[PDB]
Symmetry: D2
Amino acid sequence: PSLEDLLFYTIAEGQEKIPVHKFITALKSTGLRTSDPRLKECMDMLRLTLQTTSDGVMLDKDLFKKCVQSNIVLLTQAFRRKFVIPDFMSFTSHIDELYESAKKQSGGKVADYIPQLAKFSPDLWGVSVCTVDGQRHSTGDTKVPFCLQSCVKPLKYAIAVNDLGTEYVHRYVGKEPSGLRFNKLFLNEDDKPHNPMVNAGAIVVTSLIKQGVNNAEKFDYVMQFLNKMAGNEYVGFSNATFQSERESGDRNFAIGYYLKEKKCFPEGTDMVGILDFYFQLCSIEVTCESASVMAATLANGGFCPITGERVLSPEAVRNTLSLMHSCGMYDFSGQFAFHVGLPAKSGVAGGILLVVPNVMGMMCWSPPLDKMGNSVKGIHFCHDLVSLCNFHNYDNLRHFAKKLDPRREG
Amino acid sequence: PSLEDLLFYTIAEGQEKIPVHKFITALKSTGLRTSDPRLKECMDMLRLTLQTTSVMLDKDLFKKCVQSNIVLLTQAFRRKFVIPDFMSFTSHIDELYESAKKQSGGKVADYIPQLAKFSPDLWGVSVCTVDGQRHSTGDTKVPFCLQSCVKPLKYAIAVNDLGTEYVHRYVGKEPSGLRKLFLNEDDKPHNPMVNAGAIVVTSLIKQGVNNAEKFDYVMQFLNKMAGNEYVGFSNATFQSERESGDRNFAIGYYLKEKKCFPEGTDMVGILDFYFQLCSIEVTCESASVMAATLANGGFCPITGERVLSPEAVRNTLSLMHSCGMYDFSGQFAFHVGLPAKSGVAGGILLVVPNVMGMMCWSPPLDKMGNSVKGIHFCHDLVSLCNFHNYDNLRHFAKKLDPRRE
Amino acid sequence: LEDLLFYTIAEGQEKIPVHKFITALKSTGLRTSDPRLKECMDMLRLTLQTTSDGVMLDKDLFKKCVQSNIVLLTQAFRRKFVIPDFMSFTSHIDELYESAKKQSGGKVADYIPQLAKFSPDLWGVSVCTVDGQRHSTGDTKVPFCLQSCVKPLKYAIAVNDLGTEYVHRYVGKEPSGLRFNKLFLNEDDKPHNPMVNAGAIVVTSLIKQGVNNAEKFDYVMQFLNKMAGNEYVGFSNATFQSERESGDRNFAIGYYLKEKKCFPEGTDMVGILDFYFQLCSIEVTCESASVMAATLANGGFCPITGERVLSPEAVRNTLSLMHSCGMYDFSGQFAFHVGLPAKSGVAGGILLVVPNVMGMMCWSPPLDKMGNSVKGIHFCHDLVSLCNFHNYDNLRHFAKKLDPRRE
Amino acid sequence: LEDLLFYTIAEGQEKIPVHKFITALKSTGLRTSDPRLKECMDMLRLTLQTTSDGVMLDKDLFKKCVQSNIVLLTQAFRRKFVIPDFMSFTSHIDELYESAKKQSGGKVADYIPQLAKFSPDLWGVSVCTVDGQRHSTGDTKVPFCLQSCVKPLKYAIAVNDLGTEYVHRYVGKEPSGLRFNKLFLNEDDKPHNPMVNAGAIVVTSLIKQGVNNAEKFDYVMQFLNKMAGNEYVGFSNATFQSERESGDRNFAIGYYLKEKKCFPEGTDMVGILDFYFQLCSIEVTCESASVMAATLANGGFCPITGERVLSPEAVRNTLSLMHSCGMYDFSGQFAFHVGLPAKSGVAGGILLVVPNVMGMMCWSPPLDKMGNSVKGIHFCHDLVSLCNFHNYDNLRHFAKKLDPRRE
Ligand SMILES: O=C1Cc2cccc(c2)OCC/C=C/CCOc2cccc(c2)CC(=O)Nc2nnc(s2)CCCCc2ccc(nn2)N1
Ligand SMILES: O=C1Cc2cccc(c2)OCC/C=C/CCOc2cccc(c2)CC(=O)Nc2nnc(s2)CCCCc2ccc(nn2)N1
């Protein structure tokens, strides 16, 4: 028998001429993007064939085999409904409803501390999905660049644990939420910052990455890493934000000096330069779409879902998801872990990097923040999502009442 | 095409007439115990048949026995259970057991002479999967008191009966942070897993009846969770708990002061109730079933009864994660990443959601009040298997995944 | 000496009329009922029988009366007392009184409907100087409970009997600070200081260990009597019952103190709570308490009797801790602006000491947000505005401030 | 009367030799270099130029010299000074000095090489009474940096120039409590009090706003000069450089203060830090600082010059906060046992005030666990053991305590 022919017979649906657009529509509905890096060979071959074939454009069983041979494994999984979310079309319908519902939540205040963060409209609201299989969906303003800000903190932590290991990184930074208040103290009882998700801790993590090269190269090292995570979709940098970050960052300077005082950095740190590096990393840009891929990498045990690259060690992914759970959302972390139960990280731009382990990554973005510094619409959507689907870290996969389970069906 | 006869062929392995012994040994190896409540009909029918003579079973006789329970027996035999190769897995649990056995550190709680009576050499581990597959090693049939292990169970009951929204009017939902205080910033105890919080939870259950009936209500509930296995009560522990519980009295009075209990609570009675609930007895085996119920979305795995609402199970697992192990909670959630609850008797109620429940018991506690061997075992377990809450199900590194075959 | 005083009081003319001597004596601030004046007054009473007539003293007859108490009478008349112009001073106290009277703010403790019984309009101020000069204005003879005002008194007793070193094994010596009066124990597992509930409860357990609560109470009461020069010291059983029937916080403290092994070996903690509640229910009037305060002002000698009541060690320690921990959450503010050893109580009492000058008791039931008598606190501020009494005022160069110790 | 004093000093009219008058004068505790004695000593210098074989003042010649300063000289000689047996008293200071000398424990601050340069054997004690009577023992003329001793002085200046109300908009008035300056700010987002680094830094930003750091420093120096009656005040640039090179903690505080908008509008925060570091690097000797302390003891009048230097408002506020916040983590213990307004510095200095009696400066580089001079702390304890100087001692009834104001 033949896998290619088996798929041909599936897609054929009654002829030996599967029209090209018909194959494309079938492929798109699996949630896969036509532009999937893992589908390049197949799409190149169809483009070629559309050039050489007599106008018409209907593949022979033989011609179809010619196109899909290269990528047959992945195409089969997609078509034979084997993906983590089999009925992806229905699911995106749900994401859209959740999107529209959160859209109505107009409260919140746009971060005003930079006239840059201030530049964005409060009406921007975007949601991007990327599953662990590379199935994609977006709604709203998902192609508008914005800064990660604190969303970057778990990513740089992952990089540090990836390169240095858990044991070394946690010599410098604790592993638990502060509890004590919001961001009040810099250090816990051991004279370390409480965890990697707090400013003090992020600043220390920053000082562990790529020690002994200049900030230009350090930045490149992190950016290349971020590129892998996003499957080479948009990752940029706002110098505007960077300038404003350093011009107004008195609190961070205070933290830096105190960290110096208490000998919190690795031997021979340049403590003013680390702050500069810190400010840069917070000024890196994403769109909803590219960040959702980053989240999906974390969802996928450190493999970028749309490229198949191993990006982070599973040790780094686990540690990062652990600390995103418990420390991810500033003062709301406890409440959030309790009600939503998802590893998530917020940013002052209005971003929420969200992971549903073994299912998907997401990025929600709406500039208006709540009292505690979390995107209003983002937080509303996170609640709704977990209301709707049995995704919450301590939900049951067998008994979950009136919840929908998107991994079931097909 | 015959559901029963199909399984008969499978068990038969050719030679017509599956011997009794051989069917029993095949059944036991799926991890099921012959005393499974869901296997009652089948085992009753085998007992009947084992009276009618003084041998083997026809495809007709086998069908006679297994017809009643064919669904469950098929799943077991067609290796469909959460852990397919359960025989291999128990081998691993045994290794983990022996390894933790060698950890002789720790101090037995001597604050009550009842707790001080126990030997530091006791060490037991019981497994119950969400499918009712069981395994034990060491001293798993020795009764001991839940103590603080009871806190999540009573909380589940409260949320089950009253709902999340009401219960959390009285008790917070997050870990405290500092070791010391009774109340958080909102004048509620920080969460249900702390003494102050447990005491308040206690005052929400079965309001408006006496302590005798309240206790019965909790017992009935505990019975469902354990699939009617051993649940007892140590009056000895209870007396010592009340005679020496100055701290708890202090908490009670402060809770009274700050008007923390529901309208017109008798706070000294609630303390009495509290002391009783901490003095309830389990064995490793029975408690592992309770844990398995929590693992199983509130359905008792060995009976199939709906015991707790999924809301109560989620909330309880959430708070066990983050507040379960006193001062070690943060470290534990980080390294082990399993909902767990410890008790001063040396108990550790452990849940791996969607896989199994466990109870580990060794009386010697570490500096922070957690069973030495229990804590060592929990670490080992997660070292070995991809069970940690944020492990990846697809890419995990030279970790074993017991759900795969 | 008697003759010298005779000539002084004489004012030349006839014989000194008896009422004239009485008016002169009263104006020195002394009360005719001074215990240290007993002999003199008895003799004048006798004489005003035994020679019934015009009722004027011979130089010889005056000598007959005053010989017994000539020392004290001389000091009073030769303007040698701590406040020489006492008549003028009381005029000032009256102005300060009236000014504080106009402060109508504050809420009366309702937590016992026994405490709730008092009118918010009650307001009294009593002065007793280190020399026994007295003055009162407003409702100074109305009995009220010390409540927390008793805490320094019992502490003094404990340090008096046991010494500083032993007592401070059980109780700390500094203000709490820690987000107000929330925790029971400091970092050493002791209550922060004797002025806090937790600390007072522990102090209570150090006094007269090994006798029953009836006798313990008597022991403290006899002590309190000496301090007040045997003026009114009473007990409100009503308050006591309400104190025990609603004191959940104190019970919480008791149990925690038990837990943490904070009491002396073999304490009955529930009995100590009972004792505690009793001591808080002891009654004073403004006048009698002002004498107690004056004893503290006077290095432990009761000013109106001359009895040695407390060791100087106990008086110093108590004044030290009244300075810094005396007024609950307001202690810091109070020490800064008023700079007086003071202790407040939920009845509306403020036991006030100006070391080396006088003791005072101010009472107005309405309390401010922090639990201090509104009018009491207002008066304390005014007093220190007016006179250079603040602990760190200068005795040489002060402002437009009046200095009542100067002529 | 000059003639009156001549007879007093005469011992027996025979013409009173020069050295004999000088010896008599020195014994009152006054130094011949007293600024208030300039006229007298100038006249004696003139007269001692005329003859060449001794001098032996006439009655009219003595009158010629002393007439200018007769008031002050009389008070000194007619034993009217605050301590009127000063010879005996200095004997006691010497004993206290020798006793504290034997306390060899403690660690010299090595955080700056300048502080590390000092010998642990240095130990000096200087007394200046509110009347200008002086005494010294040990290494009292060796310059050292005030460091934190400067904090109350700058605060006084700020309150002197701006008033209490304004200054306390920026800085709190109570001790930190939480522990030893772990937090920067209290609940109101102000540093807890002027004695903490955070608070001192803010106080620094209030003085002489709107001029450059050169002039600001000059302004403070001029003020310091007045306080010390123009005795030694200097500056260690070495210390200053080390202070700024290694003061990461202070920078941390600076940035946090900036963040929380704690400075007056349009402060240059990095410059205020620079100013701060300078002020901590100002040099004194035991002797000159003891005069500064005496000014605080004397309601803001420099005892050796009679100049009004600080308003009594500033002096009271400063003494208040020295009481309660003066000695870092030991403040509470110190206030309790010693009961004197005092301020320590990491150089080993302890600026000490006994209000209405005297100022002192003790210096020994070795610090205890909490950052206070070992010998300094030991001496303060001894001093209060010996004399009834403790803030809550009684002036009439004290123990086997000596009272140097009596005679
Ligand atoms: O352990 C010690 C000695 C010690 C040692 C090292 C460090 C220390 C203390 O610093 C403490 C750090 C302060 C945190 C305040 C949170 O900040 C807040 C602000 C506003 C409101 C609140 C908290 C909530 C609240 O009321 N919590 C309380 N819940 N129960 C209380 S209060 C009183 C019952 C008695 C239980 C109890 C508790 C403590 C101690 N003694 N007894 N003392
Ligand atoms: O916000 C305020 C006013 C306020 C408001 C609400 C409650 C308050 C006080 O009570 C404090 C409640 C907690 C005490 C934890 C005791 O338990 C501990 C014992 C030992 C160590 C530690 C904690 C950790 C630690 O100290 N880290 C740091 N130590 N110094 C730092 S960091 C650098 C200054 C941080 C910047 C800063 C400075 C001042 C304030 N806040 N932030 N003050």
